[PDB]
Write a protein that binds this ligand. Structure first.
Ligand code: QZ8
Length: 289
């Protein structure tokens, strides 16, 4: 879990996450090829704040061990221990968002339901730590193989206080608003229940197959008026959601699955299902058949 900079060998640039870039590297202490391939996260701007944030992600990630959560491996104190890099497992098939677009040939509803279940279970696990993810979306889930997805992107995750069921985030500025529960948009309140709302959007994403014009931003913007810019977008999204405006049932999506979506998208926070409810329902659906 302490990786030496001189043995971390660059292989590929991957995405460019919030703190900075992510690379695929080979860790080869024996210097001969033959090491483990890993993902290495870097911090672009190591300010007092960005570092504190990066360090918080590391603690969080180091504290989780679950089949459907990306593996923490360690840290690398490069530049003479004057820089730090997070070392994680490398999942070869990238984000669930890209996978669904690139590998339709090997995806059916059963696979979609498997992914759905796996995400729910990772989310049950986070809840036992009182962690709120706050950023659930297929772009933030990673694919190990055709049978296995893992939740990643713990850069925005927060811990609920001892006895507070919600966390108010001082000011969400430049947010993924189209995944957010109304009370997150209106009050900056995040909770297990707001994660459930977002999971609903994730379930929608799965069944739209990240198709051309059916993404949540595209759909919401169609409903609201594609003309709209800046804050009018937010104003109209809120008003829309408050009075039961919802994303449409994807083409070929079963009614039973759309109902799961609609139950997650309850304005009434308490009435949303739990992740435990959701895992059971999805697994039962799979097991019937
Ligand atoms: C963190 C990670 N582990 N394995 C990965 N495979 C990828 O294709 C992409 C990432 C990644 C995750 C977050 C931000 C950028 C890239 C990734």
């Amino acid at each position: 879990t302490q990786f030496e900079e001189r043995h971390l060998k660059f292989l590929q640039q991957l995405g460019k996450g919030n703190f900075g870039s992510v690379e695929m590297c080979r860790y080869d202490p024996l210097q001969d090829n033959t090491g483990e391939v890993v993902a290495v996260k870097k911090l672009q701007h190591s300010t007092e704040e960005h570092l504190r944030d990066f360090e918080r992600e590391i603690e969080i990630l180091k504290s989780l061990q679950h089949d459907n959560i990306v593996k923490y491996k360690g840290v690398c104190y490069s530049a003479g221990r004057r820089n730090l890099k997070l070392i994680m497992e490398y999942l070869p098939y990238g984000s669930l968002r890209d996978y669904l677009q690139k590998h339709k040939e090997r995806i059916d509803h059963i696979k979609l339901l498997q992914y759905t279940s796996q995400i729910c279970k990772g989310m049950e696990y986070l809840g036992t730590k009182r962690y709120i993810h706050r950023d659930l979306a297929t772009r933030n889930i990673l694919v190990e193989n055709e049978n296995r997805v893992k939740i990643g992107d713990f850069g925005l995750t927060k811990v609920l206080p001892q006895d507070k069921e919600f966390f108010k985030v001082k000011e969400p500025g430049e947010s993924p608003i189209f995944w957010y529960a109304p009370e997150s948009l209106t009050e900056s309140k995040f909770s297990v229940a707001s994660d459930v709302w977002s999971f609903g959007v994730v379930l929608y994403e799965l069944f739209t197959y990240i198709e051309k014009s059916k993404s949540p931003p595209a759909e919401f913007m169609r409903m609201i008026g594609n003309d709209k810019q800046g804050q009018s977008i937010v104003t109209h999204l809120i008003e829309l959601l408050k009075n039961n405006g919802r994303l449409p049932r994807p083409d070929g999506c079963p009614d039973e699955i759309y109902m799961i979506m609609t139950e997650c998208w309850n304005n009434n926070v308490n009435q949303r299902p739990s992740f435990r409810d959701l895992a059971l329902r999805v697994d039962q659906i799979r097991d019937n058949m």
